[PDB]
Structure formats: C-alpha cells, structure tokens
Design goal:
Layout lengths: L1 E3 L4 E7 L2 E6 L5 E7 L4 E5 L5 H15 L3 E5 L5 H4 L2 H6 L3 E5 H21 L3 H9 L7 E3 L5 E5 L2 E6 L11 E4 L4 E5 L18 H7 L7 E4 L8 H17 L2
Parallel strand pairs: 5-6, 6-7, 7-8, 12-13
Antiparallel strand pairs: 1-2, 2-3, 3-4, 4-5, 9-10, 10-11, 11-12
Helix pairs in contact: 6-7
Bound molecules: zinc ion.
PDB class: hydrolase, metal binding protein
Keywords: metallo-beta-lactamase, antibiotic resistance, hydrolase
Assembly: monomeric
Length: about 240
C-alpha cells in the first residue's frame, strides 16, 4: 500500500490498481498511475525530469507489468511534460492537448532565446538547452477533449477552462469515480500565477462538479473527496477578490 522508492519518490495505493507516485523533493508533486483491466497502464502527469521519470517507469515495469503504457500530459509545465523524453524512450504513447504542445514549444523557444542573450559559458549553455522537455507525440483538440477506451474501460480527458494554466486538463476514470484535477486543484493557496487565469478559475473549477468524483487528486499534496473542488473555488474566489480581477 505504501512504498519508499529511490530518488526520494514514494508510491501510495489509493484504490485497487491505482497509485499516486510522489516526489518528496519537489513539494510533494503527484503523478497518477492506474492499471486498466486489459493490462494498459495510464500515467497522468509526470515527474519534473529524466531521473524521476525513469525511476517511476522502472517501478511501473516491476510492479504492474503493463501490456502497454499511455501517458497523459495535464499541462505544459515540467510536471506535465517533464516525463515525455523518458516515456517516449520506453515506447509509451504520450498524449496532450494541441495547446499544451504549442505552449511547450513556445516556452522552449523563449528559453533558447534567453540562453543566447545570457550564457558566456558554452559548455553550460548546451546543457540547459539539452535539459528542455519535449511535447507529447499525440494531440487532441483542447476544447473537445479525448475519451480513451481500453477494452470498454473509459478514461476521459477534459478541459474545464483556464485556471492554473491556459491549457490545463483533468482526467476522469468513471468506473472508479476518480478525478485527477492536477494543478487546478488548490485547496489552500493558488501557488504560481505566471501562467494562471485567476479570473476564470472559479468557473473552471465549478465545471469539475459535473464529475461524480469520489476521489479528487491534486497536483501536489494530499487528495480528498468532492470537497477538494469546493475548497479550490473558495481559494480562487478569495484571490479574485483580493487582486480585483
Ligand atoms: Zn503548472
């Protein structure tokens, strides 16, 4: 039910065949790992970089013996796209919205530009550009979302509107009534606002109530029930009020 892994990762069982894998160095960041009845393992979000992702994938190999792996990017930030390089190297099928891929490409370019203006050390410069994440191989139109069927078992990817980021999506598992809300679930404080649409956040979070969720999993920290959505709306609304948005 709970294991300590190398690289300060943990894996915690939350339901039959469903685990949350967490990086304790990176503010208790959450990755969902769910095994379908047909042997498919679905991974939602990612660790920030290659060593974390490879550790995760090795744990999946040893404990889940997947017939196939499908990874779904929640948004363009590193906790979302940081695993794509390693997922792909392992032959996993990586998915995101079109907008997520677009913003990841834009962000890489912005960074390459800044690296050009800044770095005098040529050895270092190559190492940072080399550290860039890649987008997913497979893409869906953000607003229509995507429904996977794994031998009749459904996994729904859905855009409730912009919140933590312009492209943030959630993943719902209707059989187990499990919602991975990721970084748009913020029960106490909103965190990083650089890419956020705080004005839209209350409405976007309200849309998550359309899911009959028994468990809601956030991008960081403990999960909970449907009340995780309620708490997020109050948090977002407080921020809208404070910031006059
Ligand atoms: Zn983020």
């Amino acid at each position: 039910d709970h294991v300590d892994l190398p690289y300060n990762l943990t894996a915690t069982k939350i339901d039959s065949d469903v685990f949350v894998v967490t990086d304790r160095d990176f503010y208790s960041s959450n990755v969902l790992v769910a095994k379908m009845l047909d042997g498919t393992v679905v991974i939602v979000s990612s660790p920030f970089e290659n060593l974390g992702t490879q550790t995760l994938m090795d744990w999946v190999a040893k404990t889940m013996k997947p017939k196939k792996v499908v990874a779904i990017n929640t948004h363009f930030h590193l906790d979302g796209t940081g695993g794509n390089e390693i997922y792909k190297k392992m032959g996993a099928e990586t998915w995101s919205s079109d907008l997520t891929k677009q913003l990841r490409l834009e962000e890489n370019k912005k960074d390459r530009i800044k690296a050009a203006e800044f770095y005098k050390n040529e050895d270092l410069k190559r190492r940072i550009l080399s550290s860039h994440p890649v987008p997913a191989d497979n893409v869906f139109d953000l607003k229509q979302g995507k429904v996977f069927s794994f031998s009749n078992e459904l996994v729904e990817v859905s855009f409730p509107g912009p919140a933590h980021s312009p492209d943030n999506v959630v993943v719902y598992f209707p059989k187990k009534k499990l919602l991975f809300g990721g970084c748009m679930i913020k029960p106490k404080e909103l965190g990083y606002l650089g890419d956020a649409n705080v004005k839209a956040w209350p409405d976007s979070a309200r849309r998550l109530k359309k899911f009959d969720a028994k468990i809601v999993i956030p991008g960081h920290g403990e999960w909970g029930g449907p009340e995780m959505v309620n708490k997020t709306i109050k948090v977002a609304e407080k921020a809208v009020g404070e910031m006059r948005l």
